[PDB]
Amino acid sequence: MEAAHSKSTEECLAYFGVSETTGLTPDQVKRHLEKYGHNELPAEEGKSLWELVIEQFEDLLVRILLLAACISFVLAWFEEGEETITAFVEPFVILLILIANAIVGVWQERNAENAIEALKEYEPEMGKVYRADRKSVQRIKARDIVPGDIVEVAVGDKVPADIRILSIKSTTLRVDQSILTGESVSVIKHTEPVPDPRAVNQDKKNMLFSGTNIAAGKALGIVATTGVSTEIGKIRDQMAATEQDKTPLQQKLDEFGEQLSKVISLICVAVWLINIGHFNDPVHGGSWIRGAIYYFKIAVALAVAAIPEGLPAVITTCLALGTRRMAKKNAIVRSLPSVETLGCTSVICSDKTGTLTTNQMSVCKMFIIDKVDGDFCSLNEFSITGSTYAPEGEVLKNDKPIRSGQFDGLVELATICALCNDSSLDFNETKGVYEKVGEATETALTTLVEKMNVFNTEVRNLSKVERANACNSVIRQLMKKEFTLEFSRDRKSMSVYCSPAKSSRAAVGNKMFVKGAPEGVIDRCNYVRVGTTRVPMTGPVKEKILSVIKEWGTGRDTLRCLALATRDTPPKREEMVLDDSSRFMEYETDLTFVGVVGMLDPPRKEVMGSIQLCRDAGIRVIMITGDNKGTAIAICRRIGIFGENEEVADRAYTGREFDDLPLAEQREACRRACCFARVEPSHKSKIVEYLQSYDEITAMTGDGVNDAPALKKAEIGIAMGSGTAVAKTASEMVLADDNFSTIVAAVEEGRAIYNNMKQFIRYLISSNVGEVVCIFLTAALGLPEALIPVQLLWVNLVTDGLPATALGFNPPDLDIMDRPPRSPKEPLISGWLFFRYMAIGGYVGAATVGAAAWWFMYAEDGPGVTYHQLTHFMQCTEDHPHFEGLDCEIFEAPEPMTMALSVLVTIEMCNALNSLSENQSLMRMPPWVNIWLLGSICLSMSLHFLILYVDPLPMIFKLKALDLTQWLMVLKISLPVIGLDEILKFIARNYLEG
Numbered sequence: 001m002e003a004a005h006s007k008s009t010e011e012c013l014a015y016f017g018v019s020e021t022t023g024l025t026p027d028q029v030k031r032h033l034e035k036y037g038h039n040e041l042p043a044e045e046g047k048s049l050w051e052l053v054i055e056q057f058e059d060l061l062v063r064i065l066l067l068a069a070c071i072s073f074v075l076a077w078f079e080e081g082e083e084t085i086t087a088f089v090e091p092f093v094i095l096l097i098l099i100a101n102a103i104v105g106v107w108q109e110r111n112a113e114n115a116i117e118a119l120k121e122y123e124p125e126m127g128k129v130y131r132a133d134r135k136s137v138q139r140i141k142a143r144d145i146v147p148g149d150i151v152e153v154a155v156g157d158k159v160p161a162d163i164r165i166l167s168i169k170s171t172t173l174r175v176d177q178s179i180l181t182g183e184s185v186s187v188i189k190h191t192e193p194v195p196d197p198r199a200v201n202q203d204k205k206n207m208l209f210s211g212t213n214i215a216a217g218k219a220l221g222i223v224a225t226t227g228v229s230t231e232i233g234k235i236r237d238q239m240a241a242t243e244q245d246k247t248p249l250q251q252k253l254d255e256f257g258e259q260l261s262k263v264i265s266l267i268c269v270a271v272w273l274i275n276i277g278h279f280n281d282p283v284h285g286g287s288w289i290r291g292a293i294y295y296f297k298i299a300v301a302l303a304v305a306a307i308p309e310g311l312p313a314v315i316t317t318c319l320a321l322g323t324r325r326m327a328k329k330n331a332i333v334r335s336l337p338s339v340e341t342l343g344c345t346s347v348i349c350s351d352k353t354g355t356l357t358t359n360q361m362s363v364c365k366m367f368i369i370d371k372v373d374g375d376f377c378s379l380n381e382f383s384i385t386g387s388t389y390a391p392e393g394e395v396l397k398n399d400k401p402i403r404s405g406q407f408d409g410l411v412e413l414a415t416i417c418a419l420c421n422d423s424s425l426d427f428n429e430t431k432g433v434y435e436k437v438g439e440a441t442e443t444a445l446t447t448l449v450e451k452m453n454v455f456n457t458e459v460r461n462l463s464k465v466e467r468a469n470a471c472n473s474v475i476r477q478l479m480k481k482e483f484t485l486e487f488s489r490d491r492k493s494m495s496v497y498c499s500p501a502k503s504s505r506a507a508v509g510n511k512m513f514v515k516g517a518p519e520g521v522i523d524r525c526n527y528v529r530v531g532t533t534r535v536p537m538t539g540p541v542k543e544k545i546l547s548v549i550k551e552w553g554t555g556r557d558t559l560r561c562l563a564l565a566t567r568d569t570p571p572k573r574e575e576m577v578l579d580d581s582s583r584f585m586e587y588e589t590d591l592t593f594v595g596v597v598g599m600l601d602p603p604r605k606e607v608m609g610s611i612q613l614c615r616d617a618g619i620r621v622i623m624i625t626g627d628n629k630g631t632a633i634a635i636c637r638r639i640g641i642f643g644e645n646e647e648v649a650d651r652a653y654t655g656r657e658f659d660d661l662p663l664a665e666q667r668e669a670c671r672r673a674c675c676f677a678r679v680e681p682s683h684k685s686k687i688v689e690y691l692q693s694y695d696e697i698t699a700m701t702g703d704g705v706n707d708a709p710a711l712k713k714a715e716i717g718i719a720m721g722s723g724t725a726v727a728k729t730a731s732e733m734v735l736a737d738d739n740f741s742t743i744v745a746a747v748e749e750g751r752a753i754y755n756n757m758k759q760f761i762r763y764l765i766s767s768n769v770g771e772v773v774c775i776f777l778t779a780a781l782g783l784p785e786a787l788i789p790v791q792l793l794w795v796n797l798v799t800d801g802l803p804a805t806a807l808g809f810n811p812p813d814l815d816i817m818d819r820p821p822r823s824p825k826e827p828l829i830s831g832w833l834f835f836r837y838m839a840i841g842g843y844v845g846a847a848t849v850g851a852a853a854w855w856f857m858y859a860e861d862g863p864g865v866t867y868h869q870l871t872h873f874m875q876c877t878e879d880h881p882h883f884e885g886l887d888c889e890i891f892e893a894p895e896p897m898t899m900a901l902s903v904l905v906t907i908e909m910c911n912a913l914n915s916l917s918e919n920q921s922l923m924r925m926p927p928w929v930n931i932w933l934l935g936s937i938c939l940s941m942s943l944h945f946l947i948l949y950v951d952p953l954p955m956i957f958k959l960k961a962l963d964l965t966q967w968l969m970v971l972k973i974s975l976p977v978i979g980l981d982e983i984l985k986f987i988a989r990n991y992l993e994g
């Protein structure tokens with residue numbers, strides 16, 4: 001029964017055919033269990049280890065690498081040498097890389113924590129029901145409860161299903177619903193129907209929600225819904241159905257993969273088309289077997305040269321380090337890839353209270369009526385100092401301290417403030433600073449009366465915990481508080497019924513004290529207090545009062561106003577139905593207006609500055625608040641979201657107003673709106689949807705279970721440090737200090753990290769192009785392999801991995817926050833840059849092939865076969881152009897591989913320098929601009945010597961220590977790559993200056 005809150009108790013019992021005093025029969029149980037299922041959220045998909053190891057092997061590039069591993073393994077077998085250790089090395093490396101990769105992918109899943117699974121914290125194991133088969137209450141497993149069940153709850157219980165309250169067995173039933181409604185104070189429950197079939201949860205005062213807690217009392221109820229149908233179950237379904245997108249870089253990486261894979265196959269076809277003349281060779285002689293091994297050897301080298309194998313690790317390392325840095329600035333990033341998205345944020349939607357403001361509420365203005373004489377009226381206005389919940393402050397009229405007690409009107413104002421109040425003050429001795437005990441707005445009052453000290457009680461003598469509630473305790477001794485009519489959003493007021501404490505043979509002199517939003521309270525005043533006297537409420541007195549409230553609430557003071565009032569002749573106690581909240585407005589009629597208080601929940605000190613940073617960075621800020629609309633807009637003006645004087649008629653919306661717009665107008669509202677007031681949790685989700693319809697990258701704040709869906713939907717869900725764990729697990733980021741400014745600082749960090757990532761992505765991928773040209777050159781010209789997979793793999797994982805990682809530490813540009821958000825669709829490499837890496841690639845390909853071919857020919861350590869061309873053969877049974885001797889297999893020498901490799905290494909060190917800046921010359925942005933980079937380059941070269949010298953390794957990699965002559969050639973050919981880039985950077989910096 002979804003609409004239970006709107007049905008009578010009788011109607012709810014009738015629907016399920018259940019007797020309140022017996023409960024369900026066992027036939028009913030069996031039928032209801034079959035119809036409605038068990039009372040639980042569906043279990044998580046069992047994702048197995050085998051099913052998960054396989055997912056690691058779904059990435060296209062890892063597939064290519066696996067294919068290459070198999071050809072490399074197959075080749076290690078069907079071979080012609082004798083060395084048993086040196087062969088199976090290659091396929092083991094690739095295999096090991098794929099395995100280490102899988103190990104990690106798996107680590108991340110056993111440690112992954114999901115939001116839907118965290119909701120289960122809120123289902124209790126047991127609940128209590130009355131069923132026909134037994135007289136006494138039976139404790140059963142929550143999961144076996146069904147709709148129609150008669151259930152019983154008591155103080156401390158976790159609510160087990162969504163239950164319509166039948167009977168409250170205690171004096172009141174108080175419930176902790178904070179997780180679902182964001183109501184901090186436990187809320188009173190009743191049993192009468194709530195008429196609106198579409199009531200929001202906060203109005204469902206006759207309902208208990210699954211997952212919430214009984215704070216006081218004992219109650220009988222009938223189970224309305226279970227499982228996925230409860231409020232929290234529907235929240236679990238909304239999250240389930242939300243599909244999150246791959247980040248822009250993830251999408252680019254996949255696109256890169258697809259294309260790279262297409263290029264690879266194309267180059268194979270090319271290497272085939274280029275050696276098509278082999279169909280002209282006599283079938284007799286030669287070696288097909290030794291030719292086919294040659295095409296497969298290069299296919300493997302091609303695969304290895306194309307993939308940036310070390311890239312995922314560099315990306316991960318850079319992200320972890322950034323993450324650690326962000327945490328020191330209160331931004332706890334939960335998802336490493338979100339860092340990029342955060343850098344792209346174009347809208348931040350932020351709750352106000354506690355995030356944009358300190359949530360330290362403090363009264364700084366109040367007034368009572370001074371006098372009323374026909375058309376004439378005056379008010380007595382005061383200021384109150386002290387922005388803390390601490391009783392540190394004093395009252396002033398025209399900036400001069402006064403005695404509060406010397407105004408009877410004030411005495412009553414404080415009386416109402418103290419009695420009509422569920423909250424209080426605590427002096428927390430672990431911290432020193434005072435903390436709210438309840439609602440913030442109420443504690444401001446508590447704090448007010450202490451500062452007012454209307455009866456002049458001796459407080460300078462008391463301590464610091466005896467200070468928290470002194471002047472309050474005085475006022476309590478005055479009146480017996482009988483009951484309270486709790487605040488509700490329809491009437492926007494609350495009241496207390498009181499009778500004199502000292503009261504002999506007198507049934508008379510009871511008072512109700514009423515506090516609430518001014519408009520409805522004032523409309524219900526027929527009288528105005530003036531000192532201790534009373535006079536009829538009339539037009540010019542009302543004008544005067546509403547006029548001041550308008551200025552305090554809509555002006556630059558941005559205060560929340562409450563009107564305070566007393567009913568002088570309240571109804572007889574017995575003539576009041578305390579059980580029907582619908583009558584409460586009526587009990588609070590025929591009131592006497594006493595006064596108005598104005599309180600401020602001040603903006604955080606950094607907020608103004610961060611709002612400005614957002615405007616500078618092209619990031620829109622939307623405030624979401626529970627203030628009325630007028631005060632909402634005033635506060636937006638105050639912190640600079642709106643200009644002091646700009647028109648905002650269609651840039652601010654209440655939840656009400658927004659609902660009244662047709663769908664098309666709502667989408668349009670979201671694109672221009674900066675302020676939403678009094679909105680429901682559903683609105684945050686709609687706002688995010690509409691914003692995603694204009695391709696915004698949106699951050700949204702949240703704290704409760706009710707915020708979880710919207711946090712999941714937003715590109716950057718942002719949870720409060722002080723909030724629920726469910727909100728945390730549904731978010732990309734947590735603010736450990738709750739501060740909006742932490743968001744802005746995280747975004748800037750995102751922008752700077754990403755700009756560095758660009759450089760190292762471009763740097764690593766650039767070398768892969770360079771490597772492929774080498775392999776394709778080698779197979780084009782019929783040359784001996786200049787580089788083998790194992791070498792390339794060391795370079796891609798280690799040699800270039802360090803400088804790439806160092807490029808992550810590139811100093812950020814000074815104008816990072818002076819530019820619009822980066823377009824998500826913006827390519828990492830395109831246009832002129834494409835051409836640059838085209839040219840570098842071609843250079844690098846030529847330079848490596850060159851060095852190997854130079855050794856074979858013009859080098860005097862090797863067989864100076866100058867223009868003798870390796871082109872000719874790698875056959876060696878024809879022995880044509882060696883007219884006399886007995887030596888041939890020098891085609892497998894490690895020296896020319898060492899030439900190529902040291903060229904590759906050196907060029908890449910050079911190109912790491914080229915990568916410090918996209919377009920700035922090294923003459924303006926020198927190498928020492930990044931110490932880590934120089935440091936890494938020294939480390940890579942050291943390691944290059946390691947594999948050249950440390951004996952097990954030279955043999956493994958097939959290399960031989962170079963000559964001082966040969967190193968000098970390495971440098972001769974490698975260094976110019978700097979010249980080429982410096983020229984190319986020059987061309988971009990000058991003939992594209994528009």
Ligand SMILES: C/C=C(/C)C(=O)O[C@H]1C(C)=C2[C@H]([C@@H]1OC(=O)CCCCCCC)[C@@](C)(OC(C)=O)C[C@H](OC(=O)CCC)[C@@]1(O)[C@H]2OC(=O)[C@@]1(C)O
Nearest residue numbers: 252255256259260263306768769772776828829834837838
């Ligand atoms: C990795 C190694 C090679 C050899 C491969 O060619 O990479 C290409 C490739 C896949 C792209 C290209 C490479 O394209 C070429 O080099 C032209 C083909 C030359 C034929 C060779 C014949 C001997 C990148 C690498 O380089 C150059 C020089 O322009 C740029 C960029 O890469 C990126 O933007 C990085 C995105 C992660 C991509 O065009 C990208 O494809 C895309 O979708 C992008 C948008 O990704």
Ligand SMILES: Nc1ncnc2c1ncn2[C@@H]1O[C@H](COP(=O)(O)O)[C@H]2OC3(O[C@H]21)C([N+](=O)[O-])=CC([N+](=O)[O-])C=C3[N+](=O)[O-]
Nearest residue numbers: 353441442487489493494515516517560625626627678679
């Ligand atoms: N949709 C709404 N409709 C009406 N009032 C609302 C609404 N949403 C919030 N409020 C008011 O805005 C608050 C939370 O702000 P945030 O930090 O969440 O943006 C609320 O505090 C009081 O009224 C609530 C209140 N109370 O019990 O809730 C009792 C009051 N009282 O009489 O003691 C008055 C409150 N008040 O706002 O003045």
Ligand code: NA
Nearest residue numbers: 711712714717
């Ligand atoms: Na999200």
